[PDB]
Swiss-Prot record:
It comes from Homo sapiens (Human). Belongs to the peptidase A1 family. The chain holds residues 58 to 453 of 501 of the full protein. The lineage of its organism: Eukaryota, Metazoa, Chordata, Craniata, Vertebrata. Residues 18-349 form the Peptidase A1 domain. It is a single-pass type I membrane protein. DXXLL motif is required for a proper endocytosis and retrograde transport to the trans-Golgi network, as well as for regulation of lysosomal degradation. The transmembrane domain is necessary for its activity. It determines its late Golgi localization and access to its substrate, APP. GO terms for biological process: amyloid fibril formation; amyloid precursor protein catabolic process; amyloid-beta formation; amyloid-beta metabolic process; cellular response to amyloid-beta; cellular response to copper ion; cellular response to manganese ion; detection of mechanical stimulus involved in sensory perception of pain. The active site is at D36, D222. The keyword Protease applies. Monomer. Interacts with RTN1; RTN2; RTN3 and RTN4; the interaction leads to inhibition of amyloid precursor protein processing. Interacts with SNX6. Interacts with PCSK9. Interacts with NAT8 and NAT8B. Interacts with BIN1. Interacts (via extracellular domain) with ADAM10 (via extracellular domain). Interacts with SORL1; this interaction may affect binding with APP and hence reduce APP cleavage. Interacts with NRDC AND NRG1. This is Beta-secretase 1. Residues 1-386 are extracellular. Glycans are attached at N96, N115, N287.
Length: 393
């Protein structure tokens, strides 16, 4: 399983993430597993569901061990719950290794498995601190690295209902997947893949906010989120700016809320009137940053319609957040993204699968120098619950 074996090992549907094949148990049961850098549990459907046709059957695995401990995971949008255990786990199109990992067997869920998305489970690739029920449940990637010689790194090339492809290179960086410079921003703290944005520009114009507003209350890289999600004040200033640039076209309010498609005659979409967005990320060097520049074709996402085959129709894929900035697939589909856990940094390069425009290019460019920052990171108010918990590791 050299890096040629791992190229193209991702599939998905637009708007429902990317999954990789994994096997669980002995004899191996093959499942499609969502790649989720925004959570830290490995959890698989483990009972029948109307929208699943396979699921992990613990009773058919000779290597399964029950940990006799439940877990309940709520989301704003639904939930999953299940029974913790361990089993043997392998990635057939990844490194040639097998490991004993924690697995949550999902026994009940609500609004988690969607009609026809094709994944049966989720691979949380973030760190132990945010694992449920607590940080004592070792995430999959920590077990992989500890049990094998796989380097403590992985990279994602997400390529963008329409079918999508990409690659997850486990343990390395595949130079066939990008062009140009790889630029690294630091992992601010190991929980989410948290990073710090220092400046935002919409068509070359600076939003000019206090840069802490960009990271309120965090900014994270999240392959499990579709949109670019922006804190309220940032989202408002962004919408004001894009609306200004595209003011030839008066769209309804529901479009800007992502609740409604806007259309043009097939092949005639005026791409030029929608501006590029540049996010400047903290550099590895003090006072330096680099920018990642997003095309309009990344944040206005085509949705094919029944009554409008005559037309190219689009949904606005930037949305307001109350939980900080989220660089989801909208951002990641431009780029080859390196999750360099060994060196506590995330790299960005232009992807070999480009999502292209007539006259502009998704880009990664630096350096840009200032006088930083003067600290653009936000310090989340410490709860008594947080404060009192002992971490004896
Ligand atoms: C990682 C995962 C599966 C967690 C989740 C749990 C639940 Cl219960 C509902 C939706 C999501 C979700 N929603 C994604 C969309 C999605 C749905 C399914 C697979 C991948 C991504 C999202 N993007 C966004 O801008 O807001 N929510 N992503
Ligand atoms: Zn296969
Ligand atoms: Zn103690
Ligand atoms: Zn702890």
């Amino acid at each position: 399983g050299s890096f040629v074996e791992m190229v193209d090992n991702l599939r998905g549907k637009s708007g429902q993430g990317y999954y990789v094949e994994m096997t669980v148990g002995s004899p191996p049961q093959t499942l499609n597993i969502l790649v989720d850098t925004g959570s830290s549990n490995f959890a698989v459907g483990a009972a029948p569901h109307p929208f699943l046709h396979r699921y992990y059957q613990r009773q058919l695995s000779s290597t399964y061990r029950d940990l006799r401990k439940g877990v309940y995971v709520p989301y704003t949008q639904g939930k999953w719950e299940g029974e913790l255990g361990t089993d043997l786990v392998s990635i057939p199109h990844g490194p040639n290794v097998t490991v004993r990992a924690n697995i949550a067997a999902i026994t009940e869920s609500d609004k988690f498995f969607i009609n026809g998305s094709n994944w049966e489970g989720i691979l949380g690739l973030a760190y132990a601190e945010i694992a449920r029920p607590d940080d004592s449940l070792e995430p999959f990637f920590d077990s992989l690295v500890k049990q094998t010689h796989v380097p403590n790194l992985f990279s994602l090339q997400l390529c963008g209902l329409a079918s999508v492809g990409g690659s997850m290179i486990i343990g390395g960086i595949d130079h066939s997947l990008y062009t140009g410079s790889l630029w690294y921003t630091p992992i601010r703290r190991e929980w989410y893949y948290e990073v710090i944005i220092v400046r935002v520009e919409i068509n070359g114009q600076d939003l000019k906010m206090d840069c802490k507003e960009y990271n309120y209350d965090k900014s994270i890289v999240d392959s499990g989120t579709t949109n670019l999600r922006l804190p309220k004040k940032v989202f408002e200033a962004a919408v004001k700016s894009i609306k200004a640039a595209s003011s030839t076209e008066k769209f309804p309010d529901g479009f800007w809320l992502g609740e409604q498609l806007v259309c043009w005659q097939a092949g005639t979409t005026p791409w030029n009137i929608f501006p590029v967005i540049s996010l400047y990320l903290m550099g590895e060097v003090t006072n330096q940053s680099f920018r990642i520049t997003i095309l309009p074709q990344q944040y206005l996402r085509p949705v094919e319609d029944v009554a409008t085959s005559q037309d190219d129709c689009y949904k606005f894929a930037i949305s307001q957040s109350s939980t900080g900035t989220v660089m989801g697939a909208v951002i990641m589909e431009g780029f080859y993204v390196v999750f360099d856990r060994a060196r506590k940094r995330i790299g960005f390069a232009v992807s070999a699968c480009h999502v292209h425009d007539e006259f502009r290019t998704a880009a990664v460019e630096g350096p840009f120098v200032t006088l930083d920052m003067e600290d653009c990171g936000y310090n989340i108010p410490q709860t008594d619950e947080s404060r009192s918990h002992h971490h004896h590791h």
